[PDB]
Each structure stands twice: as structure tokens, then as C-alpha cells.
Amino acid sequence: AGRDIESTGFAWWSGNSRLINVSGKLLGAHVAHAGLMVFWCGAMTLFEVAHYIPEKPLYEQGLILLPHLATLGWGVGPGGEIVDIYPYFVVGILHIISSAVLGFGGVYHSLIGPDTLEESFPAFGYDWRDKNKITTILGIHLVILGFGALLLVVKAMYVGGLYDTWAPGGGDVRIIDNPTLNPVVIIGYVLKSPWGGDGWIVSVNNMEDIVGGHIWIGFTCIAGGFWHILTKPFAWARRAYVWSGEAYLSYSLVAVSLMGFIASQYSWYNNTAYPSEFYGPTGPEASQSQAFTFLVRDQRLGASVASAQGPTGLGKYLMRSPSGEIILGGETQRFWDLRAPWIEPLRGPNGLDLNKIKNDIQPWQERRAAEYMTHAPLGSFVSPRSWLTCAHFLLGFVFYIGHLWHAGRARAAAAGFEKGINRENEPTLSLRPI
Amino acid sequence: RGWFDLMDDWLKRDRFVFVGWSGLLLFPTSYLSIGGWFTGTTFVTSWYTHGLASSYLEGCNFFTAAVSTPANSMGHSLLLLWGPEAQGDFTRWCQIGGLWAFCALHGSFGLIGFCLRQFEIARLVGIRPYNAIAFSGPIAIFVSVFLMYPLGQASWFFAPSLGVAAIFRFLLFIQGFHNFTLNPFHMMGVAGILGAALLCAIHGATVQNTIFEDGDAANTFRAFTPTQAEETYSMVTANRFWSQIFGVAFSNKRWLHFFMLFVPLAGLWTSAIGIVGLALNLRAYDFVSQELRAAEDPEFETFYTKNILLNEGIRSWMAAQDQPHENFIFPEEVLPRGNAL
Amino acid sequence: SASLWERFCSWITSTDNRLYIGWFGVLMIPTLLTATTVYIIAFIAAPPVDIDGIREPVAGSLLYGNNIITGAVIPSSASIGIHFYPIWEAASLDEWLYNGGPYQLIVDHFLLGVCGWIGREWEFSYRLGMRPWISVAFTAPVAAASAVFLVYPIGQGSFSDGMPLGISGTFNFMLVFQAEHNILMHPFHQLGVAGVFGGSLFSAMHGSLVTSSLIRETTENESANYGYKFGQEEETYNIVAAHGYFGRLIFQYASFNNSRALHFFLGLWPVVGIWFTALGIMTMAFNLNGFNFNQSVVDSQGRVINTWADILNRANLGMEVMHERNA
């Protein structure tokens, strides 16, 4: 039968483990889960556009997919304001309708489709041990991912453009004319330190770098896909990896765990790929905005125990960084690494210039600072950045756990003692004591 | 046979729920304690004892509903329903916190009855009574915390109230007024509890990962049957693993299980000793040398001094509402703050 | 045997060593030893650390007026934040000690060492031919340590918010965390408390049931532990007797007849609890705080009727003002 513990050795709560050695049902299960993901995307997009209040910003309504659609440039005008929600509705409808097709495909390939594929469709069958075929499938899906990255690039440069927070006078939908194709910048981003002040790949602060890096990622994925299609794993790779479905699953699990941690850090810190007009300010952004608002209200008027240069050495709410630059003083000193569009024109070679804040300040910068001070992820409302960061950090941790479990079990099953100790030739009985 | 023999035969009958002689004490006392706790958390208020709403009828949820301790005006009174405080009036008895005394007393007798039940079932089955000695840990915890501590204090008011948020309040109140984290007996209790959790997890994982391959199925729960004369997991493999991984390993199963028994029991008894010490305000609150050093050196600061300042903050900013009977009125100037310290 | 590298690999992965090394141990031993010696040296003789970054150092060393309880390795300076602060990135060794650099050194090497310990547990399980999921159990304390040492400083933006490497420092971390986030009302810390309490209860219960049903293999003049012989093939206690006692102490249905299932549950419960409490700490690092039931009861006129949550909030506020030395 193959659908019970008597014929498979797997209980019901481990029942999908019965899908390892049958290819058609495994393909159906994966297509059905993909349909579930697309259905959730479409349904949640429709839910968010159904609850969207025009006067409130996106980050004040508990929305997480509409900011993603707004970052791509759809339905957003200058300054991050949302013009119409119809393209978001179209996106939700398209996903929720393609979900029906994907769900039908999953149900067909799971229930009434052939259990195994190689006996009827040799071009799609596999054994989990034929390295050439698995590398071919990996290469095909690599080409698909590279084409998706190039599709994002085409959206960035040709079809409408992307929203940029670093455009003058607030963010705007801009066509990325000249992305950064220089390999030095991309490699430095990849090899950058992940600690404070550097941030590794999370610290990409302009759209040109994003588009150039996605160009490189797409072309590299296409090249690697063609490579893995046309090649076989080398001798060093063959002897190092376990070649089974569970081992590949564990590799994917650790990869997506690292990706989840990276995405949580991106949502928490990055304000370029995650604009603050859609996701709200970051915690450092909120703290620095509160400090900047207090500084502005001290420069104007001056009754808040700050009327001249007498307090401190510089003006109020100012101090020097550990490297000597001028930064905002107070408890926000730990957030001096923040770079935000509303504060960049006020920063010079030595840091924040007091006279430039006095004279070259703009009303929109003050409005942005005040509205970001009102909504603080750390405190001064649960930020959407907080939800994304917590959710994907938890997912990364639990998927690291899953990777450890599945990798250990893959090693045990390949070696041949995942069901227990043989009790006839016990390994520790042959080893000498001590 | 006699009437006593027939009653003993009936109480010892193999039913779905064993009754026994100890049941005559356990079942009514435990049932009344649980029912009184439900009644207090559902209907009875704390407005006349603590100045608080703790009931579902008043709008509280599971976390904030509690059977609050009696009013501080009552001393260490038994608060009998017929007692001079209530004089038979059920409403006044509930309003003065007598339901807390009802629950506490009938629950202590229920714990005694359950310990006797463990003794009786161990005697009838024919095994050693290492249960009801393990349960002496929880018994000591309950006696020290809910009985001995309020008896050493002014009244039943300072006992823990039977609720989630009430228990959290008790934790923070004891930390503020006693610095119980600094108490070495509490440290031994924390070590015992954490070590017991460690032992449970590590023993479960070690047994699950050293099982013999006694079945052809990938799921290995079916490979065990209770009528086995052979061990289901390899003790030698586990000993080798933990001796070459940690440097030391168990070689005797009996010693391992006695140790897993002993660690939480010892931790609970040490924590009970610490709470008994707290009952008379005989607390390891401060280090005299550190206080003297901080007094003569304003630039001397350690995390212990910061903890002392934090405990001062809990005491002053909670005294007014946590002890409404004292009528504490603290102006904002006298309230300690981090700014202007 | 075949080559020099093969001989090195055979020695590294040898089961004949007193302590197994393995490839994960190749990373674990240097990092753990470095963190251990630096921690000992700092606990004995480290200079005071300006943790708050406002030029008022805090002493945590024995030579500067601390005992064992009050001694700690002070977290890094708030001016450092979560910047990478090795010895070579400081102007002087005195500057490195003054800003809490040894805390970062110990934390990083200790996290690398515990990751290596997880991997080494898996590695020796594979070398001995046993099942590999002891490391999955050990992930939970590692997760908790990384949450209290690395994840929370990352979310807060400064290593000064990390847990100090001490006893009184740990208590201060707990009190400040409760004040800032109300961890007691967080359901994940409640799950962790349930996990540790259940772990203690289940360890005591399993020990009591095994010790109670020990098969008589010894005389009255010697310890009962000698009734069990290391390497014996028979079971030292009667599972049936313990199962009957447990099924008579409570109703018959509540019992673990299967020993393997019982031990799986014993492994599962505290590990899941510690996983949940570590996840709660990670979430509160990004300000996903616990439940807020403050001012949940009001009268007809609109006056707030306090609950126990209000008293808890009063205690949290009393801690908060003391922790914040600024306005």
C-alpha cells in the first residue's frame, strides 16, 4: 500500500516521510504547498487592501505586503503617499487566481497522478543518488531564479522604476538608469563586516547598488544553472556530501535559515529596500528623529535650557563620536551609525553641521522627524518592522533546528544506524575502554 | 470479618480511581480547595482587602484573576466561617478574604492526603515509597511560602495570592523587600530546578539516541514492549559518549535515577529554608563591606549596588498600592529616581 | 595511514582519545579555552568598565572590591554599541579594557565554542554509531545563551544591554528586562517557566518511579546501586510495577507504558520550553513585549480599578525610573 506504518515504517505524524522515495506524489505535495503560498499572498493582499484607510500611513495599519508592493513603485507617488490601491488589488487577484491552478496541479500530481515518475516520464524521474540529474534540476531552478532576479531588474530599469527614499526632497518613483555593475562594490558588500557601523549586505543604502547587485545575482544564477546542467559534481564534492533527499532538504533548511536571519536584519535596519514611509522608521531612526526634533526645537525659540553655546561644547543634543565626528547627544549616541534621507543634507564631512541644521533645514525633514518620533519601534504601537523581524528571526532559528535534525538523520540513515544500535555488533564494544 | 476489615477491603478495590483510606482526607479537601479557588477567581472580589478587582465578574481574565489574601486588619486568624470575624455571614467572609484561608487550609490538608495516598499505593503495590518523599519537596514549598512566610510576617496579607499576576506581584514584592535573588538558599534552589530540567532533557535525549535497533520500522516507538527482560537502550554507548564528550558519565542506572530524583528535591528544600529565613526578615539583603565602600566612595559602583537601588525603587513605587492598609502617601520628591540620584 | 593528512584526520576523529576532539572540536577547543582564560583573568583583575558610556565606570572584578556573588565581566561600553571591538581596534590596551572589550571577546569565543560543542556532540554520536539528536536537545540552552548575549544586544543596538557575566549582573539583567519588557506577562517566558517546572517534576517523578521499583539484586549491608552492574543486559527495575503505581496514583489512562515514549517526552518537554523562552527573549529584543492588562477594569464613573497587573506595572515603573539615570 505504501500509506501505512506496516508497509513504510513511518507513523502518521511522520507520514510525509513516506514521500521520499515516490516522485510523483512528492512533486504534487510541493506544487500544492506552492499553491498554498500563492493563495496566502493573494488573500492577504486582498485583506490588506480591504482594510486600507487612505488617511493613515501604511505602517500604522499593520500592513506588510502593501509596503512590499509600494517599494516596487506601484501605486505610490512622491513622498511615499499612496495614490491608488488598484495595482495592489490586481496583484492579489493574480496570485489568488494562479493559486487555483497550482492547487489543482498539486492535487492531480498527488492523488491520481503516478506515484513514481521515472517509469512513465524518464525526463522527470530521479533516484536522489543520480548526481547528474539532481544537478540538472538544480541548474534549471537556478536559471528560473536568475530570470526572476532579472525580472526585478527589468522592473527597476524599464517598467516604471522603483521607489527611492534617497531622491531629493523625499522619496519618489525613479527609473534606475545606471546601476552599479562594478564588481568591487558588490564584492565589498558581500565581504563587509556584519557588526555595527558596517552592516555587511544590510547596509546597502542606494537603489543603484541594489539593481546592480541583482543584475550580478541574476546573471551569476543563469551561468551557474547552465554550469550545473552541463557538469557533474567533482571528486571533492562527491566525497564530502551525503547524496539523498533528506540531505538536500537539510542543505536547503540551513540556507533558508540564514536567509531568514538576513531578512530579519534587513527589515530591522535597512531603510532603503524597506522605506520608512511604508514600513515606518527603524528603532535607531526613531531615536535619532526624536533627538533631532528636540535639537530643532532648541535651535528655534531656545527656552529649553539651551539659548546659546554655553551648554556643553557644541549645541544642545550634540556630542562627538568615538572617532571624533559630531553626532546627536544623549541616549541615542549608540545610534550614530544611522543614515536617513531626512538627515543626510544636514550632515557634512565631520558629521552634523550645526549651522547647516540652522539654515539648510527643510520643512519636510522636520515633518518626517516628528512623524517618526511619534511612532518608535523601541519607544519614546507595534511596528511592522518589529513583526517582520521577530517572525523571520524565529523562522530562521526553527529552520536551523530543522536543518540540524534532518542533517543528523541523513547522516545516520546513510551510515545505517538511524533506527538504533544493532545490538549484535555494537560499535562501542569493539573499542577498547578509555 | 469486622466492619473495619470490610471498609478496608472496599477502599482498596481496583477501581478506575483508587480511593483508599487516604482518599477520605484527600478527595474532599482537594475538591473543596479547587472549587473555592474557582469560586474566588470567578465571583469573589478583593476590593475590601487589597483595593483590587480580582474576579471574572469584575472583568478580569485568567492572568489577572486571583483569590487574594485576607485583609491586613485580620492577623494570622484562621478566618473560620463561624469565626468572630465573619460570624457565619458568607458574604462578609468572602469580602474579608476568608476564601483564601479556606483554600489554603483545605489545600494543605489535600497535599497531606495526596502524600498519604502515595504512601498507601506504594505499600499496596509493594514498592519502595520514593514518591511521597519526592512530593515532600512541593509540600515544603507550599508550607514555607503560603503558610510559614505569612505566619512570620504581620498577617496572611503578605502571603501569595492564588493567581497568575498575583504570583508575579509576589515575586517582585519579595525581590524588592528582601533581595531574594541574593539569598544563597534561593540560589541553591535555582540551581536545583535548572539542573533537574537539564537532567530531564539530557536523560531523555540520551535514552532516545542510544536505543537498540529492536525493530525494522523507522519510527522506533513500536520496538518497545513493557514485558521486556532486556534494556531498550545501550548504557555502554551512552556512558562512552558522555565520558568522551563531557569528561564524566553515569555508569549506574540506579545512581542516575536517584540523582535525577535528588537534585530537584534538594533545590526545593534549600529554597524552602531560604523562604523560612525570609519569613522573619532574616534576609541576605546586603553586603556590609560593599555598602561601606559605596558610602565612602561615590565613584564605587557594582551591579549589586544597582540591584539595591532597583529594590528601593520597587519598595517606594509599589508600597502605596500594594499595602493600601498602611495609607502610604509618598510625594514625588521623596520617590527615588535614576535622574537626580 | 596513507598520507600525513590521513593520519591527522585519523587522530582528530579518533575514539581512543580521553576527550573526543573531532573537526568541530578543532574550532571548539581554542575558542572555549580562550574565552575561559580571558574570563578568569577579567574576573580576577579587570579594570572597571564604563558600561553606560558617561565616564562613570562600574567595577566587577575581585581585586576592585567584589566578591564571587557581586563579581562580573561588565558588558561593553554603550559608546561602542554593537561595533566589533577587538584588541587591535582600540588605541591602547587600557582603552580596550575601559570600554568592555573583554566582554565582547568572551561572548564571541563562547558562542563559537558552544556551536562547536553542538557540532561535536553530533560528531561523536556519528562516530559511535548512535542517533544524532542529543545536539538538537543542547540547542535550547545555546539558543538561550545567544539570545541573552548576542540577539538582545543586536535588537537593542548595544552590547551594554547584554547579560553581564556574573551573578549580581545576571540579577540586574533580569530586573531591567522585567522593567523594560514585562517578561513575566510574556507567554513565551510563561512557557519556559512551565518547561523548567515540568522538567523538575518529571525528573523527580521518573527518578522516584525507577528507584521505587528497583529489582532486589543486593543485600541490606550495601547500597542498592550495586544491584546494577555496568554493561548488564537485563533491566534493573520493573517497568510494570512503576506503571501500575503511576496508573493507580492518577486515573489508569494517564500513564506512559512505553519506556521509549516516556523518555522522548522527558527529552521533549524542557527543550521545547527553553526554545520558547529563548524565542520570547529574541522577540522582546525587537520590542515585541508581553501582555499589557493595565487599566483593564473601570467603574461606571470612569475611575480605574486596579488589578494585580496594575501592581506589577507599579513595580516595573519603580524599577524603570532607577535604571534610567537620565530624565
Binding site: 575502554p433 578509555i434 | 555502554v236 556512558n239 565520558s243 569528561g247 564524566v248 558519565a249 555508569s251 | 580521553r18 578568569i40 580576577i44 575581585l62 581585586l63 566578591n67 564571587i68 552492574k229 555496568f230 554493561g231 548488564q232
Partner: peptide, 30 residues
């Protein structure tokens, strides 16, 4: 002077751990 006592106690505990690890009773099958 109490720092000397603290260090002595810590070093003694570490030495006890060392001797327990590397000078334990060697397990054998009986």
C-alpha cells in the same frame, strides 16, 4: 585578603573537576 580566599576556592574547584575527569574510576563490564 578575601580575594586570595576566593581565588583559592575557585582554583580548588577547577582542580577537583580536573581530577574527577582525568582520574575517575575507569568503567568496566562486570
Amino acid at each position: 585578603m578575601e580575594t586570595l580566599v576566593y581565588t583559592f576556592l575557585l582554583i580548588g574547584t577547577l582542580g577537583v573537576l580536573f581530577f574527577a575527569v582525568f582520574f575517575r574510576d575507569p568503567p568496566r563490564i562486570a
